[PDB]
Design a protein around this ligand. Sequence first.
Ligand SMILES: NC(=O)C1=CN([C@@H]2O[C@H](COP(=O)(O)OP(=O)(O)OC[C@H]3O[C@@H](n4cnc5c(N)ncnc54)[C@H](OP(=O)(O)O)[C@@H]3O)[C@@H](O)[C@H]2O)C=CC1
Length: 332
Amino acid sequence: NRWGLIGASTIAREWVIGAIRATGGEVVSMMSTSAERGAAYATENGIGKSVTSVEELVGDPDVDAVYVSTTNELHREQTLAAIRAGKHVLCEKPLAMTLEDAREMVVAAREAGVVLGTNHHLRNAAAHRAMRDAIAEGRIGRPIAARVFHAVYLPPHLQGWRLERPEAGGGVILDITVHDADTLRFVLNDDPAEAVAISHSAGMGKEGVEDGVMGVLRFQSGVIAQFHDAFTTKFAETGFEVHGTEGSLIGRNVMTQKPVGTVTLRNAEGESQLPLDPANLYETALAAFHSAIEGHGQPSATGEDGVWSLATGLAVVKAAATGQAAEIETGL
Ligand SMILES: NC(=O)C1=CN([C@@H]2O[C@H](COP(=O)(O)OP(=O)(O)OC[C@H]3O[C@@H](n4cnc5c(N)ncnc54)[C@H](OP(=O)(O)O)[C@@H]3O)[C@@H](O)[C@H]2O)C=CC1
């Protein structure tokens, strides 16, 4: 029920603070490296305390759970503080910057007996759940190939850290390709095995920073999945498709943060749009996380889910950089 925010972020402002409130919880405090900004942002968003120390946020006895949506080089040490305080943690993706860090987070949560969740939103969407369901109900026969299109335009207000400092987590692979990875795993119900990729810097990424990637994952089942992730492409709709021996599912406009997009089943009979019962992706994420901390079930995406999606993003990074296929090994 009662949250502390770490990070005065656009993600919490735009989506997660309201989803916490919509689903029965409260944000009692938050923490920013800036006294000035924290306090303005706490006022802007109806939060009663702001604080410039992590331990003050995390050791706040009125705080039950913590949301980490700081930049990526801070996810680990902050989520480890919350756990050491005995607070459950929803951490933003990518769960961390290295696999050893991500694994430590998952092992620390387990040993303290608190819930650790990665905020993969997409897997919450009715579109993706309906595709997961459709494949498990045989609607396409056996899956052969998937295709993910996540080439977007990074809006001017976000053209900051994402496009600089790859040492601090920027680049489109860590930011976006992690979502594709997790969404593939969710929908296909299967785990990737290796990646090949080619990345570029097509005018947005500063320095050695990629702003588009294309690649292919081999899944344990044998299915091959292509992805295109990009910050630079304004007029490319998003999409997620699975092609089977008896049907194709064609998701259009389904990779965004909003709860929109259609899913079309094509088979021998024709085409139709699968019926969707949509809801705000982060209200669903948060309702699940709230249930998890109450003892009922897991968060939508678990800390291990974020280890997998990171494992896949780092393979993709490696394959783009060396030109060599890269096995996805989580170490779990
Ligand atoms: N799952 C999902 O749907 C999404 C997840 N994310 C993830 O959440 C994280 C944050 O993303 P996002 O909210 O888009 O990024 P922002 O850039 O909005 O927020 C990140 C940090 O920027 C700092 N900041 C805010 N305003 C200023 C300013 N005026 N000058 C200097 N620094 C400022 C804040 O620092 P401080 O806290 O110290 O004030 C904050 O921690 C990333 O890990 C990203 O991957 C992002 C979008 C969606």
